[PDB]
């Protein structure tokens, strides 16, 4: 009969979950600009999660997409297409200090 006790409700102050930069985006092997965004400019490397900062599924998605874009040849392997070097940079790498 104690009406001042606590309630067994869920947490109202719960913070909304964070989102990969692509969460519910659509990764296609067709936009090479997008895939260029996640590749090292000098190498043609594919950045890891710890750089790109993507969900699991979106990393995997991006990777496969890239490889497809390479064999089908919309995108080259060993360097970032120069056209796209001047575009917005997503990743956390600092090369030049």
């Amino acid at each position: 009969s104690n009406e001042d006790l606590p309630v067994p409700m869920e947490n109202p102050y719960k913070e909304p979950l964070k989102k990969c930069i692509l969460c519910e985006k659509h990764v296609d092997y067709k936009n090479v600009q997008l895939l260029s965004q996640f590749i090292s400019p000098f190498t043609g490397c594919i950045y890891g999660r710890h750089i790109t900062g993507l969900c699991g599924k979106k990393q995997k998605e991006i990777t496969k997409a890239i490889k497809r874009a390479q064999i089908l040849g919309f995108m080259p392997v060993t360097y970032k297409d120069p056209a796209y070097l001047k575009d917005p940079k997503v990743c956390n790498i600092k090369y030049r200090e």
């Binding site: 104690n2 001042d4 006790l5 606590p6 102050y13």
Partner: protein, 99 residues
Amino acid sequence: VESFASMLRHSPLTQMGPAKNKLVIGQIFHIVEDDLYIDFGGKFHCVCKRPEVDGEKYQKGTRVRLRLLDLELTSRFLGATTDTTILEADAVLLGLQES
């Protein structure tokens, strides 16, 4: 008589809710040269560094404005049973008891 549960339900520490980005009022009870130890009343004191603006204005007994980050500093670490306490809370300095 008040039941404890009632005292809890109506307290400010409850009313505040989550600790992040709260605007709090606090008091300086101890000083080392650059460092000012501030009880905002929560459990543990936080620590601050005396700002460049009006250095000598902040003294023992002074009251202060705080932006409370975390009610206390804790984390669990590799191969630990219990998490590790700093015995302080994380806060930032805004202005001094702006009146």
